[PDB]
Design a protein around this nucleic acid. Structure first.
Lengths: 489, 539
DNA sequence: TAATAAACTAAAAACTATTATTATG
DNA sequence: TAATAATAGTTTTTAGTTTATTAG
């Protein structure tokens, strides 16, 4: 369903992060700032529908709607805009840190209960459907000790209250993420890992909803309603927009075919459609064109059953289409969808069917292959139970195959290249490869939105790794070209 | 760049009459040849046609063989096809009352082909059989016909009222036509013609026998016309040192329409006064015309727009480097999913000819991966402009030379991640055992694969892949109706269309009772969204 | 040397978000 | 006369376009 996963970062300012443990490593402060930059970046080009906010405590001036001390907001919850990154990023670096020490301040006291309360109030201000609320904490301390334990008590109360409210808490290690000197007080508040939040995943995007609700038709009489899902599809560069030269404003577009005979534009009635074959000018209306295209009503005209044992596996027309039963016209549909899938042992017999995605479109044939549920050991479901539509080829599809059967290789070579290939094996993580192009586009767009020239050219294994795998195997393949004359020359 | 077809037809009396239900095989012949020829002409094929009528009066044939090639009349000789011949075929051809020798028609058509060999590029050629094998013929012509076919080298195609192998609907998906109820005259005719054609080709000729019904369903009538696609030579080198040069071939393709639809004036029925344009006005509180050349192509980034001119992208885009078929790595054949295949075309891999070292190399590779059940990963690069893909390549076995199936594979940003409720364990929709048994009854009662003899005897009761896409034939039929009848409305759906698409009726008849048990066992409801014609001609 | 892959255009549907009807007073 | 009840507004695939760019 709809909803937004708004999130807010909370950063400590107690001067502990202002120092990098007197070493080469980045300050905790600046590492956190870089993390925030990374999250904005990964947010803008993933879903410009969330909300984000950043507030610093342990401060000198105090900015907030509630005039509380030691609390310094910077951005109330908003859609992540490039302006946010512009303003934030000038605070990073050693120079940004030292000039931030003065433009705002440098460390102070605070009271954790107050900052928690302020963040809660900040969430309350929003006027949207908030799907997931999260406050993730950036701090270097362990806990307040040189305070009254009443402060700690108030903190515990407020934390429990927020947990009641439905507010989800996270905490990040700053001094030595991985050093494991935290959590002698936070053991009962929250319910490192920030490197993950850093530049590890980017250029993503998400969708939620379903495809057309299409009628499954098994007989002329009885009915059954299902749902269609397309669990994969090519991502394209998002469509451009036509600005001005200089107003940077989208320009309108009135658009018709015109006629020189008169100043009045053409008319949809006046427009006619035709095809030319020399002596033939077949004159048609768009309407009769659609009538030509249409054959029957949208739905799944069931053809019959075919055992999975073999249909083919080398043919492909379109990406597969997941099916999930759903009450669309008829209740208890999942009642008939409860079976056909529990045991595919004899249900593997697939379902040849006639498919019609929408109005008037000439149907194809679809292989309604059942795919039973799998469970991941983390109680995670991927490839949910149901069906995948494999589009079925037609006779006109199988274009000409030139016939060339001449020579089979000698068996002394087949085992030898078996030894060759066996050395290299990649598990094929389906997430291990990426479209370089859209990602490059994204990084470019990030560049122009800010003062970055074009400092992004990283490869993501799209290029061959054999630049090192060549020596990985060594050179056994070279003498393993026992073709005496090299095919190359 | 050229093909030659010659249509010889029987116009006797047996063509006129037929068993009821098994409609006149001559009308089957005319319909099949009609959509054949209109496909030829619509596809602007660099084709060639000769039309001959035998069994009719006179001898339009150049040679009557000492008045022995009698009743053999060429109708429309070797010239570029037009609607004249097809309209004559569908309409102006009428049933006759006498016959001649079909073999003589064959040889004179071959002679016409021989006559039309000069001045025109000569590439290929075909002959097809249209005779119900009840005419009168000799038996000593086997030598001359076998020598002509073994020297003049014209591919043959057979057709029959029945097949080599009420309920008999039209010859589409229905019960097999009898192969033993024919007249004996047709028996010796079929025997001798099948002997001569197997002598032409060989064993695969035994499968080359077809019928009007087969041409209706299958595409053998259309496979004798063909167009090869261009090679795509590439270096499939594997590694960093050795090199393999091979070629690429588009194998499977979403074959769409190639001919567009111009937008036409209703009055002049022309295009000149129809100029399509836009002005690119500007959105402000006031309308303001702005030149098309006053614009920049920005993008929606964050909550604003970053102007990104072409001169920008052209020099920040992904500078790929040439076509390539490099290999990334390897994984198990299980480490792929039919749900995971991606792209728009299966591309088949073949070793480049004239380089047999590559041939043996890939033969060994495909054999090895077949042995290891191991699939490969390739970065598929097309050119200097197409962005690269990542795709699986795995062996495809066959009785002939094998091949390597290559398919594009998705990317990490291409996967769509949804969650679905697990209905394998439904506390609200757990299927009843009566429902389960009804399900089993439906599964077993109806099926579209005939398994028998336990000899891997897989025959599809509804073989789909041999069907073409009906949209094209429907388009063509409407084209004929419109161009021949300037003031007539659109024709009906050409029931043959459905007949091709209807499933075998015996299946639904046998499984109707299981269907009745389903309709009894399960609860169903209805809802809105029914669409209808609003205003109707009541009369 | 034209195929053709890609950028480019409408077009239909879902998931929304809402408004006409009664209802009962 | 407070209770519902059809409905149009965003995205989004699709899919026919048009367009370069190796090619004979």
């Amino acid at each position: 369903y709809s909803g937004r996963d708004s999130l807010i970062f909370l950063v400590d300012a107690s001067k502990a992060m202002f120092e990098s443990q007197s070493e080469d490593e980045l300050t905790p402060f600046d590492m956190s700032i870089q993390c925030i930059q990374s999250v904005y970046i990964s947010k803008i080009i993933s879903s410009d529908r969330d909300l984000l906010a950043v507030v610093f405590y342990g401060t000198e001036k105090d900015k907030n709607s509630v005039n509380f001390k030691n609390i310094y907001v910077l951005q109330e919850l908003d859609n992540p805009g490039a302006k946010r990154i512009l303003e934030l990023d000038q605070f990073k670096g050693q120079q940004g840190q030292k000039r931030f020490q003065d433009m705002m301040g440098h460390g102070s006291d605070y009271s954790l209960s107050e900052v928690l309360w302020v963040c809660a109030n900040l969430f309350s201000d929003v006027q949207f459907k908030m799907s997931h609320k999260r406050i993730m904490l950036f701090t270097n301390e362990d806990n307040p000790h040189g305070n009254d334990s009443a402060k700690a008590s108030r903190a515990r109360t407020k934390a429990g209250d927020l947990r009641d409210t439905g507010i989800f808490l996270d905490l990040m290690h700053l001094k030595k993420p991985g050093g494991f000197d935290i959590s002698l007080f936070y053991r009962d508040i929250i319910s490192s890992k920030l490197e993950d939040l850093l530049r590890k995943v980017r250029a993503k995007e998400t969708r939620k909803r379903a495809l057309s609700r299409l009628k499954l038709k098994l007989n002329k009489d009885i009915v059954i309603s299902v749902g269609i899902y397309n669990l994969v599809q090519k991502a394209l560069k998002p469509p451009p927009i036509k600005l001005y030269r200089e107003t940077n404003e989208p320009v309108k577009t009135k658009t018709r075919t015109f006629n020189t005979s008169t100043g009045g534009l053409l008319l949809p009635s006046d427009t006619k459609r035709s095809q030319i074959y020399g002596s033939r000018q077949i004159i048609l209306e768009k309407e009769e064109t659609e009538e030509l295209k249409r054959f029957d009503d949208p739905g799944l005209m069931l053809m019959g059953f075919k055992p999975l044992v073999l249909l083919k596996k080398h043919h492909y027309l379109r990406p597969s289409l997941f099916v999930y039963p759903e009450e669309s016209l008829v209740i208890g549909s999942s009642t008939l969808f409860s079976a056909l899938l529990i045991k595919c042992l004899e249900k593997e017999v697939a379902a040849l069917c006639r498919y019609t995605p929408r109005r008037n479109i000439p149907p194809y044939f679809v292989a309604l292959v059942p795919q039973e549920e799998e469970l991941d050991d983390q109680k995670i479901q991927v490839t949910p139970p149901g069906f995948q539509l494999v589009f079925l080829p037609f006779a006109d599809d199988k274009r000409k195959m030139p016939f060339t059967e001449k020579i089979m290789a000698t068996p002394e070579q087949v085992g030898k290249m078996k030894a060759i290939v066996e050395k290299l094996r990649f598990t094929y993580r389906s997430d291990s490869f990426e479209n370089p192009v859209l990602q490059q586009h994204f990084r470019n767009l990030e560049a122009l939105a800010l003062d970055l020239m074009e400092p992004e050219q990283a490869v993501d294994l799209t290029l061959p790794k054999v630049e090192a795998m060549n020596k990985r195997l060594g050179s056994l393949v070279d003498e393993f070209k026992e073709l005496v004359y090299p095919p190359d020359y | 760049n050229k093909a030659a077809v010659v249509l010889c037809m029987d116009v006797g009396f047996t063509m006129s009459n037929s068993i009821p239900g098994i409609e006149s095989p001559f009308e089957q012949a005319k319909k099949v040849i009609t959509m054949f020829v209109q496909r030829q002409v619509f596809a602007e094929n660099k084709d060639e046609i000769a039309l001959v009528l035998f069994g009719t009066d006179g001898t339009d044939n150049p040679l009557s063989g000492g008045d022995q090639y009698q009743n053999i009349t060429v109708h429309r000789h070797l010239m570029l096809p037009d609607f004249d011949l097809l309209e004559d075929i569908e309409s102006k051809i009428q049933p006759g009352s006498q016959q001649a020798d079909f073999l003589d028609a064959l040889i004179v058509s071959m002679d016409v082909i021989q006559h039309e060999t000069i001045g025109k590029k000569f590439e290929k050629r075909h002959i097809e059989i249209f005779t119900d094998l009840s005419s009168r013929f000799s038996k000593s012509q086997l030598d001359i016909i076998i020598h002509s076919l073994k020297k003049c080298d014209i591919s043959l195609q057979f057709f029959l009222p029945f097949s080599l192998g009420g309920p008999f609907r039209l010859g589409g998906h229905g019960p097999s036509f009898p192969l033993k109820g024919i007249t004996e005259q047709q028996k010796e005719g079929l025997e001798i013609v099948k002997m001569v054609m197997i002598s032409l080709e060989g064993e695969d000729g035994l499968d080359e026998i077809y019928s009007f019904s087969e041409s209706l369903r299958k595409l053998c009538v259309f496979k004798k016309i063909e167009r090869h696609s261009i090679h795509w030579p590439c270096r499939l080198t594997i590694g960093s040192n050795l090199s393999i040069r091979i070629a690429a071939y588009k194998s499977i393709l979403q074959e769409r329409v190639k001919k567009t639809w111009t937008v036409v004036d209703a009055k002049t029925l022309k295009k000149e006064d129809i100029q399509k344009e836009t002005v690119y006005c500007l959105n402000d509180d006031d309308e303001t015309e702005v030149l098309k050349e006053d614009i920049i192509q920005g993008f929606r980034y964050g909550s604003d727009i970053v102007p990104f001119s072409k001169v920008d992208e052209e020099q920040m885009k992904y500078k790929s480097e040439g076509k390539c078929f490099s290999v990334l790595g390897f994984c198990k054949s299980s480490q792929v999913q039919r749900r995971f295949f991606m792209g728009n075309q299966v591309l088949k891999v073949f070793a480049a000819r004239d380089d047999e070292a590559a041939a043996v190399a890939l033969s060994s590779l495909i054999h090895a991966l077949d042995d290891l059940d191991m699939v490969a990963i390739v970065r598929y690069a097309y050119d200097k402009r197409a962005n690269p893909q990542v795709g699986v390549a795995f062996p495809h076995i066959k009785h002939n030379y094998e091949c390597l199936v290559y398919v594009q594979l998705p990317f990490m940003e291409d996967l769509r991640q949804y969650m679905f409720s697990s209905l394998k364990n439904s506390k609200k929709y757990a299927p009843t055992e009566a429902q389960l048994n009804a399900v089993d009854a439906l599964i077993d009662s109806m099926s579209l694969a005939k398994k028998d003899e336990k000899t891997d005897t897989l025959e599809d009761l509804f073989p789909t892949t041999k069907i073409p896409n009906p949209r094209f034939q429907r388009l063509f039929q409407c084209l004929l109706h419109r161009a021949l009848h300037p003031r007539e409305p659109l024709p009906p759906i050409q029931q043959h269309i459905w007949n091709m698409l209807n499933p075998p009726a015996e299946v639904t008849t046998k499984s109707q009772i299981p269907l009745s048990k389903i309709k009894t066992l399960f609860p169903l409801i209805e809802a809105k969204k029914k669409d209808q014609v609003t205003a109707q001609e009541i009369f």
